[PDB]
Structures are given as C-alpha cells and as structure tokens.
Amino acid sequence: AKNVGILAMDIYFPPTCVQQEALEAHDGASKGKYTIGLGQDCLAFCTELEDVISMSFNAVTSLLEKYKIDPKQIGRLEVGSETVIDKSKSIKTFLMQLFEKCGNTDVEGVDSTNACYGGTAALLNCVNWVESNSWDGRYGLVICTDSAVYAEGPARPTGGAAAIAMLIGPDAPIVFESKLRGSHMAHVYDFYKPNLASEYPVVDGKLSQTCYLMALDSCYKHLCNKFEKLEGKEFSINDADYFVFHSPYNKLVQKSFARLLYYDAKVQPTTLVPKQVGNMYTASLYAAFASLVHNKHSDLAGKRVVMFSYGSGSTATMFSLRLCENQSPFSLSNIASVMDVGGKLKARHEYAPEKFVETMKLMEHRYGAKEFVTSKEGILDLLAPGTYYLKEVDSLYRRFYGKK
Amino acid sequence: AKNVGILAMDIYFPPTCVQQEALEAHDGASKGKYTIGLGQDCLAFCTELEDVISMSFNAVTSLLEKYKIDPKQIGRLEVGSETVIDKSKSIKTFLMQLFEKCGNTDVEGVDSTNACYGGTAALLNCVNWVESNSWDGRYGLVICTDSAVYAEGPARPTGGAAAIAMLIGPDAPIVFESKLRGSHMAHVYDFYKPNLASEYPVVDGKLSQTCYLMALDSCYKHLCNKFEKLEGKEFSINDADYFVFHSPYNKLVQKSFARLLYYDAKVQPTTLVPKQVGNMYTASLYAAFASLVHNKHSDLAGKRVVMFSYGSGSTATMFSLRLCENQSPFSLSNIASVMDVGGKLKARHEYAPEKFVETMKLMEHRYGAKEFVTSKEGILDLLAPGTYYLKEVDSLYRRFYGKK
Numbered sequence: 001a002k003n004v005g006i007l008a009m010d011i012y013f014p015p016t017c018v019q020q021e022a023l024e025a026h027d028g029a030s031k032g033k034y035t036i037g038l039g040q041d042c043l044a045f046c047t048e049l050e051d052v053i054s055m056s057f058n059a060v061t062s063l064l065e066k067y068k069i070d071p072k073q074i075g076r077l078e079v080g081s082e083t084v085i086d087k088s089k090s091i092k093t094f095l096m097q098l099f100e101k102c103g104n105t106d107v108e109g110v111d112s113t114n115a116c117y118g119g120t121a122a123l124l125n126c127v128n129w130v131e132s133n134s135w136d137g138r139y140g141l142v143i144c145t146d147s148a149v150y151a152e153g154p155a156r157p158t159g160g161a162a163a164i165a166m167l168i169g170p171d172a173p174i175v176f177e178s179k180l181r182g183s184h185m186a187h188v189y190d191f192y193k194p195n196l197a198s199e200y201p202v203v204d205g206k207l208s209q210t211c212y213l214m215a216l217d218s219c220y221k222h223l224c225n226k227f228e229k230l231e232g233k234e235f236s237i238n239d240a241d242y243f244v245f246h247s248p249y250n251k252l253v254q255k256s257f258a259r260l261l262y263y264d265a266k267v268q269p270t271t272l273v274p275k276q277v278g279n280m281y282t283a284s285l286y287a288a289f290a291s292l293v294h295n296k297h298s299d300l301a302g303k304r305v306v307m308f309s310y311g312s313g314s315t316a317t318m319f320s321l322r323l324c325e326n327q328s329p330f331s332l333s334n335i336a337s338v339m340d341v342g343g344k345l346k347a348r349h350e351y352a353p354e355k356f357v358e359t360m361k362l363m364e365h366r367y368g369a370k371e372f373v374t375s376k377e378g379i380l381d382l383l384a385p386g387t388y389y390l391k392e393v394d395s396l397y398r399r400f401y402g403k404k
Numbered sequence: 405a406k407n408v409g410i411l412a413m414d415i416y417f418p419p420t421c422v423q424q425e426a427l428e429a430h431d432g433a434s435k436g437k438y439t440i441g442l443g444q445d446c447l448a449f450c451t452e453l454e455d456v457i458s459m460s461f462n463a464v465t466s467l468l469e470k471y472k473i474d475p476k477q478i479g480r481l482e483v484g485s486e487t488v489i490d491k492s493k494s495i496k497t498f499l500m501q502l503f504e505k506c507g508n509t510d511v512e513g514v515d516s517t518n519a520c521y522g523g524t525a526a527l528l529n530c531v532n533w534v535e536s537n538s539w540d541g542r543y544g545l546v547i548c549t550d551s552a553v554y555a556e557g558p559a560r561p562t563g564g565a566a567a568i569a570m571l572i573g574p575d576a577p578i579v580f581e582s583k584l585r586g587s588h589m590a591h592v593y594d595f596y597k598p599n600l601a602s603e604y605p606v607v608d609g610k611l612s613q614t615c616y617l618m619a620l621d622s623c624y625k626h627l628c629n630k631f632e633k634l635e636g637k638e639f640s641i642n643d644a645d646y647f648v649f650h651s652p653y654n655k656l657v658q659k660s661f662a663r664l665l666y667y668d669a670k671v672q673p674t675t676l677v678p679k680q681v682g683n684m685y686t687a688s689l690y691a692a693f694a695s696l697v698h699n700k701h702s703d704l705a706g707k708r709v710v711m712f713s714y715g716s717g718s719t720a721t722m723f724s725l726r727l728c729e730n731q732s733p734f735s736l737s738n739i740a741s742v743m744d745v746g747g748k749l750k751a752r753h754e755y756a757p758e759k760f761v762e763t764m765k766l767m768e769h770r771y772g773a774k775e776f777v778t779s780k781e782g783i784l785d786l787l788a789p790g791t792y793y794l795k796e797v798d799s800l801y802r803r804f805y806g807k808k
C-alpha cells in the first residue's frame with residue numbers, strides 16, 4: 001500500500017443562497033461589514049428539503065457514478081460532522097442505505113466528532129486503515145458534512161452548508177507525506193454547543209482568538225521539527241507551493257497565513273468556494289482544497305500543498321500533501337472536470353434576504369420536530385435533477401428521502 | 405510495528421449501586437424478572453458527583469500511574485461513547501487536561517460515535533494508527549465511557565456506567581489477528597435517541613431482535629470466510645477458546661453465543677463485571693473482556709479470544725485476538741493485578757431502591773442544566789481517595805472537577 005491519499009473527490013452544496021451585500025442592507029449593517037469584515041460574498045443554506053444526510057447522499061452518489069466506482073469496492077466509510085441528527089444513530093448508518101441493494105454491508109467506520117475537525121479526523125483514520133494489516137484491498141470513503149441554522153443575531157451571516165466525499169487508496173494523485181505533520185489538542189472553552197436543545201453556540205471571542213493562534217503556531221512549529229528531520233532544514237513559507245486552511249470566513253484565512261510569515265500566489269486560489277458558499281465547518285478546509293484543484297489543476301503536479309485543520313475545543317492538525325498528475329479517472333485533471341465547481345455556481349438560485357430569514361425561521365421550528373411533511377412547491381423545482389431531498393419526518397423521528 | 409494490540413488496561417465504575425432483587429420488590433415486578441429475565445445482579449450508577457468525563461479521568465490516570473506510563477509517551481488518544489455532553493466539544497478535549505501540565509499537546513484523535521460500538525471503532529483506529537506510515541513511535545490510548553439515566557419506566561433496570569482505558573502498541577500480550585474479522589453495517593431504526601432534549605430512546609423491539617441477529621450472523625459468516633482463507637478450514641465454536649460479547653444484559657450474551665452454535669467453558673468467565681455493574685454501552689464488550697482476564701489470566705496465554713461488538717443503528721464487528729504471556733508491565737498477569745476487579749467490587753456502596761430512584765430524579769434535573777453546584781455531603785465520603793468528581797457547572801455550562 002504505497003502513495004496513499006485522495007484518489008477522487010466531489011462536493012455538493014445546496015443551490016439556494018443569499019447575497020452578503022443584500023444582507024448587510026437588510027440588517028442594520030454599514031457597507032462592507034460582511035463582504036470586507038468577514039471577506040464573504042455569498043451564503044448557501046439548506047431549505048426544509050435538504051440536510052446533512054441528503055447532502056451526503058448527493059456527494060457519495062456523484063463520486064461513485066462519475067469516477068465509475070463500484071459500491072462493492074468500498075471497505076471503509078467514515079463521516080466527519082458536528083451536525084447532530086441523533087445522539088445514537090450515526091450519519092454513517094444512513095449512508096449504508098446506498099450499499100444494501102448491492103449487498104456490501106461489510107464496511108468499517110463510523111462518525112468522528114470535534115467541532116470543524118471531524119472530517120480531518122475521519123480522513124486520517126482512512127489513510128491509516130489503507131496502510132494497516134487489517135486492510136482488505138478496497139477503497140476507503142470519507143464524508144464531511146455540515147449545515148448551520150442561525151435565524152437571528154450576529155451569528156446569522158456566518159452560516160453555510162456542504163458535503164464533501166473523498167475516495168482513499170494507494171497510488172493517488174494527492175499523496176500524504178506521512179510524517180510531515182503537527183497536531184495540537186487542548187481543553188478549552190472557546191466555541192461550543194452545550195445546550196442540547198439549541199443550535200446556538202456559546203462563544204468566548206477573546207479566548208477563541210488566543211486558542212486558535214496557539215494551535216496554529218504549535219501545529220506549525222511541530223511540522224517544522226519533522227521537516228528538519230525529513231529534509232535537513234527549517235520549514236518556511238517558501239517550502240510549500242500552497243497553503244489551505246479551515247475557512248469559515250475569508251478574513252480568518254488572510255490572518256492565518258499572515259501569522260505563518262505570497263497570499264496572492266499561495267492562498268488566493270483556495271478561496272473560491274468558501275467565499276461563495278460560506279462556513280462549511282468540517283467540509284470547509286476540503287472545499288478550500290477543492291477550489292485549489294479547480295483553479296490550478298494543470299499547475300499542481302509536482303507541488304506541495306500544506307493543509308491546516310482546526311476545530312474549537314480544541315483539536316488541530318497541520319499536514320502536508322504531495323500532488324502529481326496520474327492516470328484518469330484518478331487524475332488532478334479528471335478531479336477538476338468531475339467536480340465542475342463552475343457548473344455548480346452557475347446553477348444556483350438566489351433568495352431575497354427576507355425569504356432567507358423566513359426559511360431560517362422555518363428551520364428553527366423543524367429542528368427537533370417530528371411528525372411533519374416538508375412543503376415542496378417552489379422549492380423542489382430549484383434542485384438539480386437527481387437531488388436527494390427530505391419528504392417527511394414521522395411521529396417516531398424517522399426521516400424519509402426522495403430523489404429528483 | 406509488529407504484534408499490535410492491547411498492552412495495558414484499566415476500568416473504573418462508580419462505587420454506588422442498587423441490587424436488582426431489591427429493585428424487583430420495589431417495582432411491581434414478580435420474582436426474578438431482572439435477575440432471571442435480564443440475567444443481572446447489580447446496577448452501578450453515577451451520582452451528581454460523577455459523569456463520563458470524571459470516570460474517564462479515573463481510568464486514564466489509573467492506567468498511566470499503575471503501569472507507570474509517561475504522559476509524553478501517548479501519541480494518539482481516542483474516545484468512544486454515546487453519552488453527549490456537548491454537540492461540538494468532544495470528550496477527548498476534556499481528557500487533554502491531563503496532558504498539558506507536562507506539555508504533550510501533539511496528540512491525534514477525537515470522539516467516535518455509534519451507539520455501543522464507538523469504543524470498538526476507536527480501538528480499530530488506534531491499532532491502524534500504530535501500523536501506519538504516520539506512526540511516530542508512541543502509544544495509542546483508547547477510552548470507552550458511558551452512563552445511563554432512566555428515572556422511570558421499563559428502561560430503568562437496564563442502566564449502568566463505566567469507563568475503560570486501553571494502551572495500544574506493538575509486542576502486546578493481546579494481539580489482533582488482523583484479517584480474522586467480519587463487519588456488518590446497515591441503515592435501521594431499531595434503538596435510537598432522536599430527541600435531543602431527552603435521554604429516553606425510541607426502541608423498536610421486534611426490529612431490534614431481527615437486526616441484531618442479522619448482524620451477528622453476517623459478522624460470523626464473514627469471519628468464517630476469512631478464516632477459510634487464513635487457515636484452510638471453516639470456523640466453528642471449536643476454533644476459539646473464548647467468546648466475548650457486547651453485554652448490556654446477560655441474557656443477550658446467552659442467546660448470542662447459542663446463536664453461533666460450551667457456554668460454561670467459553671463465555672461464562674466473561675460475565676462477572678457486566679452482571680454486577682450493568683449496561684456499560686461502549687465499554688460493555690471491554691468489561692466482559694476485563695472479566696475474562698481477571699478470571700482466567702493464567703490460562704489465557706496461547707488462546708484465541710473472539711470479540712463481538714454491536715451498536716444499534718446499526719454497526720457491528722466480530723474480530724479475533726491471540727493472547728500470550730509477555731513481560732511485565734505488559735503481561736496478562738500484571739493486567740489482572742492492576743485492574744483489581746475483586747478489590748473494586750468489595751469497595752462498593754449499596755443504595756436502597758428508593759434512594760437510587762431519588763438519585764435518578766436528581767440526574768434528570770441536572771441533565772442540560774447550568775449554573776449549579778453539586779451537593780457533596782454523604783456522597784463524597786463514598787468515593788475512593790483520588791476520585792475525580794464534578795464540583796459545579798457554571799452559568800456558561802463549563803464543568804469544573806475536583807479530586808479526592
């Protein structure tokens with residue numbers, strides 16, 4: 001099992017969105033409070049028809065269909081998220097629905113949690129599984145999936161939603177440099193969700209500030225130590241071609257890279273999807289990476305891409321990747337083609353801020369609700385053909401999905 | 405990295421408990437409804453002073469102190485559970501508290517969830533991490549931790565609480581047979597917690613019945629296929645010395661082994677702690693294993709121990725272990741000594757059923773509560789010296805712990 005990493009990749013985000021500038025006007029906010037202060041342009045959100053589960057079906061289905069992967073060929077499936085549907089039943093069990101009507105039930109892995117890190121945790125687990133004595137010769141599959149509902153308050157411009165699927169195995173175009181990494185993990189009360197009934201976090205801004213920079217510094221310093229062992233020198237900004245970050249809002253990206261000290265060369269091409277879609281939590285780092293493949297796929301072979309994953313609480317890892325052109329279907333070039341990031345941004349559907357706010361109120365009401373049917377007219381029409389959607393939640397909280 | 409598996413092990417459960425027979429009398433129940441119907445003898449529960457976090461500190465502290473492990477020597481720490489304290493902040497971040505005042509913050513891993521499987525998922529992840537190219541030479545550490553609150557109804561005799569800590573690395577006394585395994589994973593609505601506000605599950609008994617047996621059968625059949633490849637024959641009950649099961653209640657253990665078709669030889673010594681402590685969810689399989697080491701440590705070298713992990717939803721894995729006597733501190737003999745299962749059962753403190761029920765009411769009230777100080781008189785006296793306990797939860801849901 002050699003050159004293990006990401007073989008294939010896809011992204012889904014809901015087509016429904018609201019413009020940050022329009023939102024500034026609708027709110028009390030002075031010009032550029034979101035577009036400049038946050039550095040964000042557009043916000044994708046889930047309507048009543050979409051959730052972290054349906055988004056996951058879209059992403060996994062698309063990957064398997066487009067890279068032509070046989071479902072029997074998946075041996076480990078793992079999900080990273082902080083969007084809790086059930087306190088017992090993992091998002092992973094839902095995803096097994098896709099694997100039953102071809103009889104592939106022997107599939108390791110479950111859900112991994114810590115804030116916007118769980119996707120990273122799951123990815124590392126799969127890479128390790130491919131390299132282990134237990135490996136059965138099959139692909140791993142990692143999903144990152146998250147969605148935010150803030151109907152009110154200062155949090156509301158900071159939401160977003162997506163799902164990412166990544167195929168893992170040997171001889172990849174996106175190879176992990178196994179030892180080029182640094183982690184930092186601590187017990188902090190910086191940004192957390194201690195109110196089971198509520199989606200609203202408890203945020204300690206000043207401590208969040210200190211704890212994030214401490215992690216980034218420490219992760220950086222530890223990667224540098226391992227670089228010194230690996231290649232015989234200190235690691236600097238010059239020792240990678242690109243830096244990709246957890247990107248809840250673009251201003252954090254700017255500060256973070258600055259802290260490492262170029263941005264136009266090394267970081268700017270990672271900003272497309274995060275800036276247009278919003279905070280994607282566990283999927284944010286990977287959407288930033290997806291933007292890089294989209295923008296630069298023809299320049300990426302031979303290059304080093306450094307990746308920094310954060311999650312409040314806190315858990316962080318900086319790690320490194322070596323990219324090369326390979327053979328289709330698992331090539332940098334085929335990955336860009338399949339993701340069709342440009343096609344997905346054109347296919348979007350904009351909401352006036354008021355209709356966005358109404359939809360957010362609705363989402364508040366449905367959160368923890370049971371025994372309801374979703375309302376489809378005018379919304380279902382906006383979803384791409386084939387899209388999984390929520391039809392109803394029964395009186396026992398069971399969720400039933402449709403396709404189209 | 406060879407002969408990877410469990411190097412060292414410890415268990416903590418709260419010393420406070422209620423007798424199943426006394427409980428039958430207190431409830432409407434006819435003689436032997438719990439002791440025979442469930443096959444259970446005693447029930448350990450957390451009082452206001454103890455939770456999955458404090459129990460985890462007890463287990464990890466004890467392992468590191470008693471097997472004399474240096475905290476800097478842990479490279480990956482993972483937690484399995486279905487007891488949700490926060491929807492963002494993992495139990496793992498809490499545990500990092502132990503690693504800061506010696507500066508070991510570079511520690512991979514987070515929380516793994518699916519029902520009473522998450523501990524297994526986490527264990528597999530660590531074994532894989534030791535065998536991966538990313539492995540840095542250090543120990544992995546796995547925690548399983550869970551606690552139940554049922555103040556009312558038919559669920560109430562079926563609770564329990566514990567935490568288990570397992571040290572992972574090469575040259576172990578408890579070696580994984582990498583390929584001797586079978587998993588089964590499906591999308592079922594059998595036993596789940598869809599009500600974020602509530603601890604009470606939704607149970608579909610008849611479907612739970614069918615889905616559990618399907619998993620056990622399928623896991624079994626897949627392990628048999630891999631056995632045929634590995635050793636050239638079909639796997640039968642005769643091809644292992646012991647079978648250890650997820651053990652929420654002892655009657656499930658009896659049926660499950662019967663389904664594989666001896667019990668007195670192969671399964672009976674795995675029943676001590678589960679029967680005295682109750683349902684330990686993610687830690688239950690491993691407490692059953694701990695009981696086996698306790699009872700049979702001097703017979704275990706050379707033997708095969710088959711292990712079956714279940715979690716509703718559903719996720720299952722049957723896997724196999726090869727045990728041998730090794731060198732202290734990581735010997736079957738030293739592990740039995742350190743766990744002192746006999747010492748812990750003698751040190752217990754019994755509650756009349758009424759006082760148990762009052763304590764359960766209290767736990768209902770504190771669940772999701774903030775801004776309270778715990779009441780200590782009469783309870784703190786019952787905890788072993790050194791025990792971590794909850795002092796208070798502040799107005800921002802932060803939890804503060806004491807020791808003693």
Ligand SMILES: *C(=O)[C@H](CO)[C@H](O)CCCC[C@@H](C)C/C(C)=C/C(C)=C/C(=O)O
Nearest residue numbers: 115116208209212248252255310311312
């Ligand atoms: C994910 O773990 C979490 C929400 O679930 C979130 O996306 C990551 C936390 C982001 C922390 C910022 C809110 C605070 C931060 C450190 C901003 C700073 C330091 C930028 C700067 O100018 O320094």
Ligand SMILES: *C(=O)[C@H](CO)[C@H](O)CCCC[C@@H](C)C/C(C)=C/C(C)=C/C(=O)O
Nearest residue numbers: 519520612613616652656659714715716
């Ligand atoms: C853990 O995943 C879960 C609670 O969190 C629980 O401990 C495991 C589910 C146990 C399922 C039983 C309640 C149903 C069962 C199949 C009993 C049977 C089949 C025994 C028998 O006689 O067959």
